[PDB]
């Protein structure tokens, strides 16, 4: 009843040929020259090595299979850039490539918010330092203690350890129903904006004809584009001082319209 994708794959790998030294050299020379069978046989025979590194790389980011597949990508680059002329063995060279590709994938895919390798490499040094501190300081590393040891900025160390903060599933320990939509206003707040916007239209037909023609065409209330004191000149005003005197004159008469209707300080808190 062999159903598991992993056990199926590992069964297929076991079913392969294991290579020797002279055999590796023969296939490798043909492989670089561009043999189909040579490349396939070298890859298939060395799959077991990927498993060895993938086995001691689990429970860190991706699943065994995930690492086994990414590790296989390193094997391919290893076969592509192997030098059979050098007396030194393939296994030694391949180990580098397999570890490189696995580590790189584990640094990228693992983290929900994609963390750049530059920050990840820095983080490595911070954490290794923390370990040595912890062994001698019976307590755990502080941000400032780590920063002292590396001769680096406290703020930089804090930014890094903040990025280390992993996010757990919102649906998992629900949290979704606790956390409210912040971008959506309540009907209370939306209704208040309707009252303001409606009052403005009525307030526009209550002041002077030239006091609501440069006050609204500036804020973009009636007009199409929100202009500035200097930009109101494009219409008909064509002034800078007279635009600023008339803008504020429209607002002063409107401030008394809110003091008499019964807002002003009433609508100041809000």
């Amino acid at each position: 009843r062999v159903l598991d994708a992993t056990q199926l794959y590992l069964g297929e790998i076991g079913y392969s040929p294991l290579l020797t030294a002279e055999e590796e050299v023969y296939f490798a020379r043909r492989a670089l020259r561009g043999d189909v069978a040579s490349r396939r046989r070298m890859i298939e025979s060395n799959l077991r090595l990927v498993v060895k590194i993938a086995r001691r790389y689990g429970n860190r980011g991706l699943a065994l299979l995930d690492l086994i597949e990414e590790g296989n990508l390193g094997l391919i680059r290893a076969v592509e850039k192997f030098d059979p002329e050098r007396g030194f063995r393939f296994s030694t060279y391949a180990t580098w490539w397999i570890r490189q590709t696995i580590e790189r994938a584990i640094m990228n895919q693992t983290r929900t918010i994609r963390l750049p390798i530059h920050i990840v490499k820095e983080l490595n040094v911070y954490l290794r330092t923390a370990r040595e501190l912890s062994h001698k300081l019976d307590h755990e590393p502080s941000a400032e203690e780590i920063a002292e040891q590396l001769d680096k900025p406290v703020d930089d160390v804090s930014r890094m350890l903040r990025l280390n903060e992993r996010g757990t599933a919102v649906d998992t320990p629900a949290l979704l129903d606790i956390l409210a939509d912040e971008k959506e206003n309540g009907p209370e707040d939306t209704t208040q904006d309707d009252d303001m916007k409606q009052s403005i239209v009525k307030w526009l037909f209550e002041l002077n004809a030239k006091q609501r023609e440069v006050l609204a065409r500036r804020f973009g209330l009636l007009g199409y584009e929100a202009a500035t004191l200097e930009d109101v000149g494009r219409e008909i005003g064509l002034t800078r001082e007279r635009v600023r005197q008339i803008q504020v004159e429209g607002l002063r008469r409107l401030r008394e319209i809110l003091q008499t209707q019964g807002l002003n300080i009433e609508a100041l808190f809000l």
């Binding site: 056990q7 062994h135 019976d138 502080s142 979704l176 939509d181 009907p187």
Partner: protein, 1341 residues
């Protein structure tokens, strides 16, 4: 002979059964267990020692390198409990472990003379248990609850039917180790024995014996008795065992010698059997046809050819018999298998077994666990040996081996943790015995099979997990690295161990917020047993049998204390006297009965030991210093109860209380209460909030004092002596010379904890009990905790109660209370709430805690000081700002209206928002305290700095007063030693005390005493310096907070809540109520004397409830208060100490057969008037549980009070003045205000925030949530007509986004029209089904 604190107030005892054993320390379990875990034992594998020796030494895969454990040590705790609680850190000790890296040569065979590197490495901080029994994890007090699991060992069970409507009982054995794979044996409907390793696929049981190297003939010799067949001349003969036939039917004519015993075709009765046995029958002649079917035991071969005529375990025939005869065999060993008693099970299992030899069996086992992977011989031997025969992967433990050996009827208790070949066979043997009919199934619910794991075992296990994770890392790095540069600490990681332990003490189910409403809540929580959590049952898994009371629960587990809920029966409070045996089974004390005489010899018996003896009941009457009064005593054995003669009795119950738990023991007339109501009573006592004035219970039991003392919440005197100095903050006692050691200064300081926050935001306040200059003994209560009277436990307040209807104001349990209760501030309760304000650093920039806050009234900013922090003492109400905080806003693209508005007021108010911490709406209190936590680098707030100034100067004062009182107390002793052999009274006092280093006397023992006191004085002098430097460092120390967080300000509010309609109140007989109305004093029913009743409870909530305890409590309560009213009257008129003494002695010595004697007399006059002054507010009485006061004793006490024997009184209606037409029961019921206040539960919402995906309003009052309109509630509207109300609830009230705003606008516009839409939940549903790849379209009209 009574203690000093008892001389102040004596409880009258109606108990009659003398207590041979006192209530033990109640928080024994938690302390012993954890103490074993940390306890340094060289030999006795307990906690850490065991953990290291189990894993270590770890040797490398290459075998050159190895790491070995030497010893460990706990560093002293960085922060005390106090600083941990305030700062929000775990109270822990650093674990430093000595480890030796030893390296072997590869070239030499096993030369250890290369490199030995020894160093002390850090592996985590371990959380420490408080002296009270709690852990402080991230500044929160938590308790780790003891667990109840199936004991490792063997268990024999049986599906009682279940499988196969055939209805066959299939027997099974389960071998459970402490660590390893489980080993199952089971029967099949066809009587074939099967093995499940690790409950995987089924395999024939015989296969496992082949794996252990058993030939077929050896297997058969193990399970089967042999029957010999001799072939003599021509006739067949067989060696008979007289009984074997027994209850069989004779298939042939059985002839012995020449004479016929059996008739053919008749059943062989006992007479035939004894006739045959006495005649000494050994050969019987038989027909050849009887062997057709008999099973050969051994391999029989032809000595001529040397080839197999018949293989072992083969069914014989007439022709195989013939061939066997002529080969030259005239003896045939055949299996004895007569159905019934001796079943051929293993015989049939061998025929089902496809395997042949050992290897073929090991391969098939290997193929089961690892199916697909090709076998190798080395792989199959390794796997099978590593399953149950490896010291590292398999461990029954001492308890496993012990229960295993007792189940197989062994004599030896101790043995190997790994399974022997003999073990497995013995287990199979017993299984098959049980199938045959001799032997029985073990019970899972039986406490002999359920074992207790408290803390230390569980901490030990998590710590082993940590070590195992470390072992992989360690072994891995030992093999890879060069051995000589590489030291051990670069290989070890502390973070795995710390993480394993952190996850236990923090994430674990059994680690839970201590239930701190009241002392009893705490004490009962710490003695909890849970069958749930890891390695235990689940609510899904949990049946009906486990939940119910098991017979063995007697004396071990409370039958009447279990959550009424989904956890009903899985969670259990421990019984009073119960304790854990060395192996972790529960045990109970019992008095040995020798030759009928009942000794004071006391034996703790386990569940299994108890079954064996006959135990008399506690209520059984003993005769004055010898044997039982009665001939036929009521006892119990074999788990069931009846009368026995005196000679048969082995033992007796120690106390009447041992059956019951702590909480239920506090219920007075439990004996008269239904067990259900009593359960909820014990459960609601835990919910009782301590009132402002802690009032003792008038009708108590006696457990009151035990609980108050053992809980730890009271300050108790260790040393005793005379009190030098009382204060509302501290108590200093000068110790008596007899306990006072001559080394250190003999002055004890108890600092009292003042008004502090609980986990349930209740108030924890310690007040001093004793007065200035009071003599006290060891174990006297020095200060009362929150819900404690002079040493006794005081959960609520007793009240004048009358049972009678009011104008429906006590309808269904509803309670009518007098205004006088509110006035007297009884059931006024104190709630200390902790609010934090966090200054974080965002992408836009750091948040500021300035008082400079955009758009805020001067009214609001008045209460904030320079930094932006509210002043100490300031009263605050909802919406007032406590800590002003502003958050940097990134470039606000405004709506034109906001551009206009911000232009009009010009209050641009910079690039900043308002995120201030303000008082939650409707809560109102006084600020008692403020704390500031800042980071190390960041410049401190002005307010944070003045706080540190206070703490520094206060620290200096505290330590200074330590050294001053300790030096004064120490020289006061030197002064007495110098007088010993050197009279210089007035001459020594005149010269300064500071110049006494010169002063000595002649060289004797007294000169050495002077040297002790001088070395201590200077020791204290330097000690004071290093203490002060520590304090100063901690006060200056910048705290490391969460990443992002610059500083945190914690505000503590104090809220005084008054009793009010909606508040929940109960008694101790499970009698609840909600207060309906507070009646003016004038309105309340009043006595002939004019005294109004406090509470009017409904008569109809008693006979239905069958808690009659509350009525007896009320009658006795009135009698208690009757005598208090007489003493109050005699104290008001001064009168004679002689006369008071008379009345009080007659009172204490009332009861028909009162156990407690009180020979008043010896009391001095001053002791007597202090005692009467306490007895005045009602003489406190104790009614033990099951040994309580009798009705006749209560009526006799009432007559002493000149109160009516009926305990019913004439009452007058306060309103009309007319009398009630019949007498009403009045008295004092001790009442409790539970944590369920209406203030906390009242909630209302019109419109609010809405959920993220579903767009429906949120749930809960904390999130300002709408009430859930559930399926059930919808159906109600469907039943009615109500279609618009329903649509409303579905659409504009929930999801419909456009609809809700549009309808809001309409309701303010006064249109009252719906205008419905489409619910956003449905839009989501569509998207979720299309995400599955199902096209779901709306088809239009």
């Amino acid at each position: 002979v009574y203690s000093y604190t008892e001389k102040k107030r004596i409880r009258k005892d109606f108990g009659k059964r003398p207590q041979v054993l006192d209530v033990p320390y109640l928080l024994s379990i938690q302390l012993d267990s954890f103490q074993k875990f940390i306890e340094q034992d060289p030999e006795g594998q307990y906690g850490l020692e065991a953990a290291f020796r189990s894993v270590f030494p770890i040797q490398s895969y290459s075998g050159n390198s190895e790491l070995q454990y030497v010893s460990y040590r706990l560093g002293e705790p960085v922060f005390d409990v106090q600083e941990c609680q305030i700062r929000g850190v775990t109270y822990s000790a650093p674990l430093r472990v000595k480890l030796r890296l030893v390296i072997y040569e590869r070239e030499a065979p096993e030369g250890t003379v290369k490199d030995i590197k020894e160093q002390e490495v850090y592996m985590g901080e371990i959380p420490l248990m408080t002296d009270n029994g709690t852990f402080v994890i991230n500044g929160t007090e938590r308790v780790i609850v003891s667990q109840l699991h199936r004991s490792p060992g063997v268990f024999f069970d049986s599906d009682k039917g279940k499988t196969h409507s055939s209805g066959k009982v299939l027997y099974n054995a389960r071998i459970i180790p402490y660590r390893g794979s489980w080993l199952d044996f089971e029967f099949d409907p066809k009587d074939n024995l099967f093995v499940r390793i690790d409950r995987r696929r089924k395999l024939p049981a015989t296969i496992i014996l082949r794996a252990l190297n058993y030939t077929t003939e050896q297997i058969l010799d193990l399970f089967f008795e042999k029957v010999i067949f001799e072939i003599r001349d021509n006739k067949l003969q067989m060696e008979l065992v007289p009984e074997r036939l027994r209850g069989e039917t004779a298939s042939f004519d059985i002839e012995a010698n020449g004479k016929v015993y059996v008739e053919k075709g008749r059943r062989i009765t006992a007479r035939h059997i004894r006739q045959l046995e006495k005649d000494d029958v050994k050969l019987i002649e038989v027909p050849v046809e009887y062997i057709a079917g008999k099973v050969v035991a051994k391999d029989y071969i032809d000595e001529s050819t040397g080839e197999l005529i018949c293989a072992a375990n083969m069914e014989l025939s007439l022709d195989l018999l013939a061939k066997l005869s002529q080969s030259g065999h005239k003896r045939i060993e055949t299996l004895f298998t007569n159905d019934l008693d001796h079943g051929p099970y293993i015989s049939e299992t061998l025929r089902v077994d496809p395997t042949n030899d050992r290897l073929s069996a090991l391969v098939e086992i290997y193929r089961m666990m690892r199916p697909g992977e090709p076998p190798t011989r080395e792989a199959a031997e390794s796997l099978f040996e590593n399953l149950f025969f490896s010291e590292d992967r398999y461990d029954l433990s001492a308890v496993g081996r012990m229960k295993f050996n007792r189940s197989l009827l062994r004599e030896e208790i101790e043995g190997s943790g790994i399974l022997s070949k003999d073990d497995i066979i013995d287990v199979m043997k017993k299984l098959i015995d049980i199938r045959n009919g001799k032997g029985e199934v073990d019970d899972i619910d039986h406490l002999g099979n359920r074992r207790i794991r408290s803390v230390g075992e569980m901490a030990e296990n998590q710590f082993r997990v940590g070590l195992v994770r470390v072992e992989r890392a360690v072994k891995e790095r030992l093999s890879l690295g060069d051995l000589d540069t590489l030291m051990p600490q670069d290989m070890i990681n502390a973070k795995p161990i710390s993480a394993a332990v952190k996850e236990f003490f923090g994430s674990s189910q059994l680690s839970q917020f201590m239930d701190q409403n009241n002392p009893l809540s705490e004490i009962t929580h710490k003695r909890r047993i849970s069958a749930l959590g890891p390695g235990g049952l689940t609510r899904e898994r949990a049946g009906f049998e486990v939940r119910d009371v098991h017979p063995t629960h007697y004396g071990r587990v409370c039958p009447i204390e279990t959550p009424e809920g989904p956890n009903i029966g899985l969670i259990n409070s421990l019984s009073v006297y119960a304790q854990t045996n060395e192996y972790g089974f529960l045990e109970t004390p019992y008095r040995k009965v020798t030759d009928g005489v009942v000794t004071d010899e006391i034996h703790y018996l386990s569940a299994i030991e108890e079954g064996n003896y006959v135990i008399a009941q506690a209520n059984s009457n003993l005769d004055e210093e010898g044997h039982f009064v009665e001939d036929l005593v009521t006892c119990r054995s074999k788990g069931e109860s009846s009368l026995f003669s005196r000679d048969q009795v082995d033992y007796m119950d120690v106390s009447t209380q041992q059956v019951v738990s702590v909480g239920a023991s506090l219920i007075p007339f439990l004996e008269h209460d239904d067990a259900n109501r009593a359960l909820m009573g014990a459960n609601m006592q835990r919910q009782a909030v301590p009132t402002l004035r802690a009032d003792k219970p008038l009708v108590g039991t006696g457990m009151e004092r035990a609980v108050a003392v053992d809980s730890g919440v009271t300050a108790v005197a260790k040393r005793g002596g005379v009190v030098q100095y009382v204060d509302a903050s501290r108590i200093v006692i000068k110790v008596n010379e007899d306990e006072m050691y001559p080394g250190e200064a003999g002055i004890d300081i108890y600092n009292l904890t003042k008004y502090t926050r609980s986990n349930q935001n209740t108030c924890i306040n310690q007040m001093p009990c004793v007065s200035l200059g009071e003599p006290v003994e060891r174990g006297d209560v020095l200060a009362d905790g929150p819900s404690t009277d002079l040493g006794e436990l005081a959960l609520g307040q007793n009240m004048r109660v009358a049972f009678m209807p009011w104008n429906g104001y006590n309808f269904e349990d509803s309670i009518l209370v007098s205004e006088r209760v509110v006035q007297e501030d009884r059931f006024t309760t104190i709630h200390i709430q902790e609010l934090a304000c966090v200054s974080r650093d965002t992408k836009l920039g750091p948040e500021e805690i300035t008082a400079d806050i955009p758009n805020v009234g001067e009214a609001a900013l008045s209460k904030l000081d320079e930094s932006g922090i509210v002043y100490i003492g300031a009263e605050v109400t909802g919406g007032d700002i406590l800590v002003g905080k502003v958050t940097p806003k990134g470039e606000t693209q405004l709506t034109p209206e906001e551009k206009l508005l911000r232009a009009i007021f010009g209050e641009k108010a910079s690039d900043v928002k308002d995120s201030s911490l303000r008082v939650p709406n409707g809560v109102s209190g006084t600020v008692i305290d403020v704390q500031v936590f800042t980071r190390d680098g960041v410049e401190k707030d002005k307010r944070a700095l003045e706080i540190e100034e206070m703490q520094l100067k206060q620290a200096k004062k505290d330590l200074s007063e330590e050294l001053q009182i300790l030096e004064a107390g120490l020289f006061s002793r030197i002064r007495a030693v110098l007088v010993a052999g050197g009279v210089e009274a007035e001459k020594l006092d005149k010269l300064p005390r500071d110049r006494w280093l010169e002063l000595g006397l002649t060289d004797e023992e007294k000169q050495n005493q002077l040297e002790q006191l001088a070395e201590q004085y200077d020791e204290l002098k330097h000690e004071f310096e290093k203490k002060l430097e520590a304090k100063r460092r901690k006060i200056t120390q910048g705290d490391d907070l969460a990443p992002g967080v610059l500083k945190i300000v914690k505000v503590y509010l104090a809220v005084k809540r008054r009793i009010q309609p909606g508040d929940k109140m109960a008694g101790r007989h499970g009698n609840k109520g909600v207060i309906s109305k507070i009646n003016p004093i004038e309105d309340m029913p009043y006595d002939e004397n004019g005294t109004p009743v406090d509470i009017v409870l409904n008569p109809l909530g008693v006979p239905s409830r069958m808690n009659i305890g509350q009525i007896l409590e009320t009658h006795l309560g009135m009698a208690a208060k009757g005598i208090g009213d007489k003493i109050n009257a005699m104290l008001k008129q001064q009168q004679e100490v002689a006369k008071l003494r008379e009345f009080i002695q007659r009172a204490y010595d009332l009861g028909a057969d009162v156990r407690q004697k009180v020979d008043l007399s010896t009391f001095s006059d001053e002791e007597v008037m202090r005692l009467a002054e306490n007895l005045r507010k009602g003489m406190p009485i104790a009614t033990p549980v099951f040994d309580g006061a009798k009705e006749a004793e209560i009526k006799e006490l009432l007559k002493l009070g000149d109160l009516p024997t009926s305990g019913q009184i004439r009452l007058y209606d306060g309103r009309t003045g007319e009398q009630f037409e019949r007498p009403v029961t009045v008295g004092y019921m001790y009442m409790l205000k539970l944590n369920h206040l209406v203030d906390d539960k009242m909630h209302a919402r019109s419109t609010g925030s809405y959920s993220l995906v579903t767009q429906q309003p949120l749930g809960g009052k904390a999130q300002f949530g709408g009430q859930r309109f559930g399926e059930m509630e919808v159906w109600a509207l469907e039943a009615y007509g109500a279609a618009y109300t329903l649509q409303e609830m579905l659409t504009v009230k929930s999801d419909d986004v456009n609809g809700r705003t549009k309808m809001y606008k309409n309701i303010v516009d006064g249109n009252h029209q719906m205008e419905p839409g489409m619910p956003e939940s449905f839009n989501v549903l569509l998207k979720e089904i299309r995400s599955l790849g199902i096209n779901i379209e709306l088809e239009d009209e």
